[PDB]
Design a protein around this ligand. Structure first.
Ligand SMILES: Cn1c(=O)ccc2ccccc21
Ligand SMILES: Cn1c(=O)ccc2ccccc21
Lengths: 158, 158
């Protein structure tokens, strides 16, 4: 009776932070969706510090503390995902965390670039994946935050 | 007495793999530089597999095996570093590996973009750093592979 109960936690990785509203609209939708399932969002801008290294360390700690990462690997400033988000996905992988990814554009890299090379003749990967192969770990690439969250609920029960 | 001797190893992270020559010219220079100090380069294309997941897993294992990562965070397809490289830097950070970075362009992000926002009004970070703040851990951002390697030799002796 009255045993400790773990509250599930998801790190909310993605470039929403660079939106004009600093991600408010995105994060508010995330907060509302997760609240219904008693899941805590760990959001990059929470209790934000002023120094770069402190912001970084707090985000790494959120990844260490999380049960899963849901990462927005949508195109950012071109066809490639955000590198900060990629760093966080790498952190999560090394820590053996559940990593779930989605993107607004699921086409293969070569379809995105329209060729096996970019405008500067640099090679575009040909593995039938929507982004750099380091970012794919065998879990389905989802089409939305919500679809990724459904996988979380099915595969990480309370 | 013939005790075991550790050979130092550096993971060679960066988008050279996408050069037309698949990074041969870059990796050859790395090999020659490291050979002089009896340091082993762990190069992403070594013993390369055919399946994406296998290539990824082998690269993660190289990061686990390394003493340091030297990461080329130069602009790739714009002002941002390569996301694969960023993933690898995050992997190394989570594993408490020495991470050393360089770039061909050390200007602050806002200098690179010429503004506090990009062409689509998305926020450009203002922390006096050359790239996404997750990629900076307090070690100097070097100007070349060689300068990073000099730091390695000074700070990770045989
Ligand atoms: C601006 N900013 C934040 O305000 C919070 C987290 C964060 C992480 C990576 C890059 C930039 C970030
Ligand atoms: C094409 N390719 C390789 O051939 C080898 C490693 C690797 C790592 C990330 C992304 C692409 C890669």
């Amino acid at each position: 009776h009255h045993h400790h109960h773990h509250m599930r936690k998801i790190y909310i990785a993605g470039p929403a932070v660079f939106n004009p509203d600093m991600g408010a609209s995105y994060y508010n939708k995330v907060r509302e969706l997760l609240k219904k399932e008693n899941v805590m969002p760990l959001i990059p801008t929470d209790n934000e510090a002023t120094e770069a290294l402190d912001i970084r360390q707090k985000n790494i700690q959120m990844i260490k503390d999380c049960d899963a990462v849901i990462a927005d690997l949508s195109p950012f400033r071109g066809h490639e995902p955000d590198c900060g988000t990629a760093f966080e996905v790498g952190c999560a992988a090394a820590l053996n965390k559940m990593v779930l990814t989605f993107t607004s554009d699921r086409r293969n890299m070569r379809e995105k670039y329209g060729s096996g090379v970019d405008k500067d003749n640099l090679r575009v990967e040909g593995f039938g994946l929507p982004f750099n192969l380091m970012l794919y770990d065998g879990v389905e690439v989802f089409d939305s935050f919500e679809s990724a969250f459904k996988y979380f609920l099915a595969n990480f029960p309370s």
